[PDB]
Write a protein that binds this ligand. Structure first.
Ligand SMILES: c1cc2sccc2s1
Length: 162
């Protein structure tokens, strides 16, 4: 297991524009195109991202390229965030993957709501952090995925992903 395999399980792989759990146009391995309800806007974003006229469809290689970029940008964003960096750097490698996963799904605006969870994670109060993490819109809207990510934060193992 590694961050790519983990997010691949959580995000799936679809080669045509689809709507994510929030109803937003997405493609590939959880590559958000736009929050606009206009499919044409999503198609434009896709074409810009890939560098060709895709008409809403990409190849596996292209999906994996966006995924590489998106994971890289997620981790780099964490390091550039003054609130997230010290917590991330305090974590072991497996729990760092849980952090990347959460940021990938929710963005940094999303994880900003998690001050108390972050503090508990930095304190290595794992069971307490896990309880706090579940008291969230995130958990309630995507409970099976959040449970996996939370188990990863709780245990520092890959048990939830096999
Ligand atoms: C850096 C650390 C942590 S813990 C949950 C999200 C993030 S980002």
């Amino acid at each position: 297991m590694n961050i790519f395999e983990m997010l691949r399980i959580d995000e799936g792989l679809r080669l045509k524009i689809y709507k994510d759990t929030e109803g937003y146009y997405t493609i590939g391995i959880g590559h958000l195109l736009t929050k606009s309800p206009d499919l044409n806007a999503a198609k434009s974003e896709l074409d810009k991202a890939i560098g060709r006229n895709c008409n809403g469809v990409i190849t596996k290689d292209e999906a994996e390229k966006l995924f590489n970029q998106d994971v890289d940008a997620a981790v780099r964003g964490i390091l550039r965030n003054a609130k997230l960096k010290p917590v991330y750097d305090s974590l072991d490698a497996v729990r760092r993957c849980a952090a990347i996963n959460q940021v990938f799904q929710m963005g940094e605006t999303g994880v900003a709501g998690f001050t108390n969870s972050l503090r508990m994670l930095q304190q290595k109060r794992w069971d307490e952090a896990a309880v706090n993490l579940a008291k969230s819109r995130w958990y309630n809207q995507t409970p099976d995925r959040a449970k996996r990510v939370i188990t990863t934060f709780r245990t520092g193992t890959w048990d939830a992903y096999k």
